[PDB]
Design an enzyme around this catalytic site. Structure first.
Site, PDB file in Angstrom:
ATOM      1  N   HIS B  41      25.664  46.185  49.982  1.00  0.00           N
ATOM      2  CA  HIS B  41      25.975  47.607  50.103  1.00  0.00           C
ATOM      3  C   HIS B  41      26.829  48.127  48.946  1.00  0.00           C
ATOM      4  O   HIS B  41      27.215  49.299  48.977  1.00  0.00           O
ATOM      5  CB  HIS B  41      26.629  47.916  51.453  1.00  0.00           C
ATOM      6  CG  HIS B  41      27.972  47.286  51.642  1.00  0.00           C
ATOM      7  ND1 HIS B  41      28.169  46.193  52.450  1.00  0.00           N
ATOM      8  CD2 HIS B  41      29.190  47.616  51.157  1.00  0.00           C
ATOM      9  CE1 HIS B  41      29.448  45.860  52.452  1.00  0.00           C
ATOM     10  NE2 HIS B  41      30.093  46.710  51.672  1.00  0.00           N
ATOM     11  N   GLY B 143      37.652  48.122  50.838  1.00  0.00           N
ATOM     12  CA  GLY B 143      37.663  47.403  49.583  1.00  0.00           C
ATOM     13  C   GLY B 143      37.690  45.894  49.703  1.00  0.00           C
ATOM     14  O   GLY B 143      37.627  45.211  48.674  1.00  0.00           O
ATOM     15  N   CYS B 145      35.383  43.981  51.143  1.00  0.00           N
ATOM     16  CA  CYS B 145      34.094  43.330  51.304  1.00  0.00           C
ATOM     17  C   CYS B 145      33.790  42.404  50.127  1.00  0.00           C
ATOM     18  O   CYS B 145      34.217  42.622  48.982  1.00  0.00           O
ATOM     19  CB  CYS B 145      32.995  44.375  51.509  1.00  0.00           C
ATOM     20  SG  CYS B 145      33.106  45.148  53.167  1.00  0.00           S
TER      21      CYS B 145
HETATM   22  C1  P0O Z   1      33.153  48.616  49.814  1.00  0.00           C
HETATM   23  C2  P0O Z   1      33.814  47.581  50.683  1.00  0.00           C
HETATM   24  O1  P0O Z   1      34.707  46.870  50.200  1.00  0.00           O
HETATM   25  C3  P0O Z   1      33.376  47.445  52.087  1.00  0.00           C
HETATM   26  C4  P0O Z   1      33.947  46.705  53.030  1.00  0.00           C
HETATM   27  C5  P0O Z   1      34.175  47.227  54.448  1.00  0.00           C
HETATM   28  C6  P0O Z   1      35.152  46.358  55.252  1.00  0.00           C
HETATM   29  C7  P0O Z   1      35.703  47.150  56.454  1.00  0.00           C
HETATM   30  C8  P0O Z   1      36.483  48.417  56.106  1.00  0.00           C
HETATM   31  C9  P0O Z   1      37.507  48.552  57.231  1.00  0.00           C
HETATM   32  N1  P0O Z   1      37.695  47.166  57.653  1.00  0.00           N
HETATM   33  C10 P0O Z   1      36.681  46.368  57.317  1.00  0.00           C
HETATM   34  O2  P0O Z   1      36.547  45.183  57.670  1.00  0.00           O
HETATM   35  N2  P0O Z   1      32.910  47.399  55.138  1.00  0.00           N
HETATM   36  C11 P0O Z   1      32.455  48.602  55.510  1.00  0.00           C
HETATM   37  O3  P0O Z   1      33.071  49.648  55.301  1.00  0.00           O
HETATM   38  C12 P0O Z   1      31.149  48.596  56.301  1.00  0.00           C
HETATM   39  C13 P0O Z   1      29.980  49.090  55.468  1.00  0.00           C
HETATM   40  C14 P0O Z   1      29.435  50.352  56.114  1.00  0.00           C
HETATM   41  C15 P0O Z   1      30.335  50.701  57.283  1.00  0.00           C
HETATM   42  N3  P0O Z   1      31.228  49.538  57.417  1.00  0.00           N
HETATM   43  C16 P0O Z   1      32.081  49.300  58.425  1.00  0.00           C
HETATM   44  O4  P0O Z   1      32.743  48.263  58.456  1.00  0.00           O
HETATM   45  C17 P0O Z   1      32.184  50.354  59.529  1.00  0.00           C
HETATM   46  N4  P0O Z   1      31.983  49.705  60.813  1.00  0.00           N
HETATM   47  C18 P0O Z   1      31.024  50.115  61.667  1.00  0.00           C
HETATM   48  O5  P0O Z   1      30.276  51.066  61.375  1.00  0.00           O
HETATM   49  N5  P0O Z   1      30.987  49.451  62.839  1.00  0.00           N
HETATM   50  C19 P0O Z   1      29.908  49.500  63.846  1.00  0.00           C
HETATM   51  C20 P0O Z   1      28.615  49.055  63.177  1.00  0.00           C
HETATM   52  C21 P0O Z   1      29.768  50.915  64.386  1.00  0.00           C
HETATM   53  C22 P0O Z   1      30.256  48.548  64.981  1.00  0.00           C
HETATM   54  C23 P0O Z   1      33.522  51.118  59.517  1.00  0.00           C
HETATM   55  C24 P0O Z   1      34.685  50.189  59.878  1.00  0.00           C
HETATM   56  C25 P0O Z   1      33.778  51.719  58.134  1.00  0.00           C
HETATM   57  C26 P0O Z   1      33.482  52.249  60.550  1.00  0.00           C
HETATM   58  C27 P0O Z   1      28.617  49.094  56.121  1.00  0.00           C
HETATM   59  C28 P0O Z   1      28.338  48.448  57.463  1.00  0.00           C
HETATM   60  C29 P0O Z   1      27.442  49.001  55.170  1.00  0.00           C
END
Ligand code: P0O
Ligand code: P0O
EC number: 3.4.19.12
Lengths: 305, 305
Positions: B41, B143, B145
């Site tokens: 992503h 940030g 991920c």
């Molecule tokens: C760029 C970077 O570094 C990304 C790393 C973070 C780590 C996150 C941030 C906060 N703590 C973490 O661990 N990943 C994302 O933001 C992922 C990416 C989007 C949405 N997402 C979620 O995690 C979401 N979760 C969610 O939609 N949950 C259900 C499905 C409804 C159950 C939110 C928490 C944002 C709402 C995805 C799934 C493609």
């Protein structure tokens, strides 16, 4: 979100650990530039440790009696001296992996990471707090002496602890990197008692703010309190006094959450007087006091090194 | 003695972390030999993540659209491909700090260390367990991920987890290093539910052995039980079934302490049926299930890497 007991990344310290052997005693040393620091009891047999005269034992040792190994490489010792309870072994090679570093003497209530080592090789990393009675609750076996504790700030490693001994109830004691013990302890295998420990109040408060930031809010009540009235209650439950300095240090967390420190004190007072009634805070059934305000901010804001 | 939640030394992994930026999305990548692995992503805007077609987004990207930075050094991308939910970026420079490594897919109940990173820089290390519902209880912010989880055995890093998302109650989900999610999750910001979690029985037993080794023995009773009768009680309290495989794995701890596994099961059964009556085990007021039998042996025997 989430909140975990989190240690500093240990790589900068791993590059500094060596094995030190003298006679039949082996432990860990810390190799920085061209000096290896290690606990002085490496020069003792187990019998000597009951009542050692370290100055006398050291004068009978020469440079060559100290076998220092960095992985599979022996480092040649070219000088030696004793500073309080640590030995400084000058070696003929400077450690190319030396980080930017400082030696610091931490205060009770502050936290640091411990890199537990055996035979100069790292086994694990965990976070500890310097207790008010100048001990730490660590995890250390035979051969772990010379394992160090540290904090990292940007690129700079602040070494603050070197491990020396274990006290009843699995509690641990050691020195700063100038060889001065934290607390009223000496490096001798003879009866010694630690003082009564107390709960680090400012850290408990910091952890309650961590709980609010994570959405665990059930314990917030509608009241406030004075600093004096809070400290009368805290004393009864063996909590350290909360000072105005502590209030100021909690400022960033208070400003982030909009909860004044004295209001969080009112909530802590109720928890102390009434208990948790089988509920948990951040997964814990007991109040946690090994997170500093800075630890909370770091983890909840993502500070890197 | 002492018993702490202990992470693996992180240095070998720290040397592999990089920053990956595509467009305006930045996260972490894992640089091994001449390949950088990161969550796919990174090619999404925040709007795309609500309903992404990753195959379509990737075909509109070229090698040069991926900015990979290892500290202050940009690494030139010379190829790219997608494998399940991870991207593989071929770079023109092999990482000189690559450890001996393997990619493994861990089983529920197993533990690993997480090196939490932001902007390619490590912020902290902590130990996690893969829960029976294929989530972990981590600590992750925006940030984070591409942060990875790992085990170390001698010199070999077994990478087992890459972080992708957060689920309600601060629970975390991610993939193995071949990009396959643990559990029934997809990398899309849309409603998804984790299954009911359960307590990892074999780990609770391992931790009770850790308590005995440390001299916390109050909970040992005089009884034994059958494996079938234990599992009838465990089920009621939302504990995983204990299998004969689990009994065999607990063998080393049972042999060390002289306490048969089925006798420790009788003691655990009483704790479940009667509670702890305000007492603690290894400092905890709740039973702990995030130490494997191997974690206990490692910590109580001093295994190094
Ligand atoms: C760029 C970077 O570094 C990304 C790393 C973070 C780590 C996150 C941030 C906060 N703590 C973490 O661990 N990943 C994302 O933001 C992922 C990416 C989007 C949405 N997402 C979620 O995690 C979401 N979760 C969610 O939609 N949950 C259900 C499905 C409804 C159950 C939110 C928490 C944002 C709402 C995805 C799934 C493609
Ligand atoms: C070679 C190496 O690597 C050494 C590292 C270990 C770490 C220890 C081992 C077990 N867990 C640890 O943390 N240090 C020692 O063995 C120190 C050295 C002797 C005795 N000692 C103790 O720790 C003792 N404590 C003790 O006498 N305690 C009172 C004073 C009565 C309160 C015993 C636990 C052995 C009884 C000293 C003080 C010169």
């Amino acid at each position: 979100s989430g909140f975990r007991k989190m240690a500093f990344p240990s790589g900068k310290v791993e590059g500094c650990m060596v094995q030190v052997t003298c006679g039949t005693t082996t432990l860990n040393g810390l190799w920085l530039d061209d000096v290896v620091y290690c606990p002085r009891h490496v020069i003792c047999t187990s019998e000597d440790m009951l009542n050692p005269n370290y100055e006398d034992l050291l004068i009978r040792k020469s440079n060559h009696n100290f076998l220092v190994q960095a992985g599979n490489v022996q480092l040649r010792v070219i000088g030696h001296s004793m500073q309080n309870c640590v030995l400084k072994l000058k070696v003929d090679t400077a450690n190319p992996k030396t980080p930017k570093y400082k030696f610091v003497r931490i205060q009770p209530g502050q936290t640091f990471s411990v890199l537990a080592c055996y035979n100069g090789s790292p086994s694990g990393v965990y976070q500890c707090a310097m207790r008010p009675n100048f001990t730490i609750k660590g995890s250390f076996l035979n051969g772990s002496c010379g394992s160090v504790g540290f904090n990292i700030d940007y690129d700079c490693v602040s070494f603050c602890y070197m491990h020396h001994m274990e006290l009843p109830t699995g509690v641990h004691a050691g020195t700063d990197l100038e060889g001065n013990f934290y607390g009223p302890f000496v490096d001798r295998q003879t009866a010694q008692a630690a003082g009564t420990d107390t709960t680090i109040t400012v850290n408990v408060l910091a952890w309650l703010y961590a709980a609010v930031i994570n959405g665990d809010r059930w314990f917030l009540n509608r009241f406030t309190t004075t600093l004096n009235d809070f400290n009368l209650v805290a004393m009864k439950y063996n909590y350290e006094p909360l000072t105005q300095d502590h209030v100021d240090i909690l400022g960033p967390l208070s400003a982030q959450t909009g909860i004044a420190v004295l209001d969080m004190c009112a909530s802590l007072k109720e928890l102390l007087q009434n208990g948790m009634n089988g509920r948990t805070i951040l997964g814990s059934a007991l109040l946690e006091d090994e997170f500093t305000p800075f630890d909370v901010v770091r983890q909840c804001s993502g500070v890197t090194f």
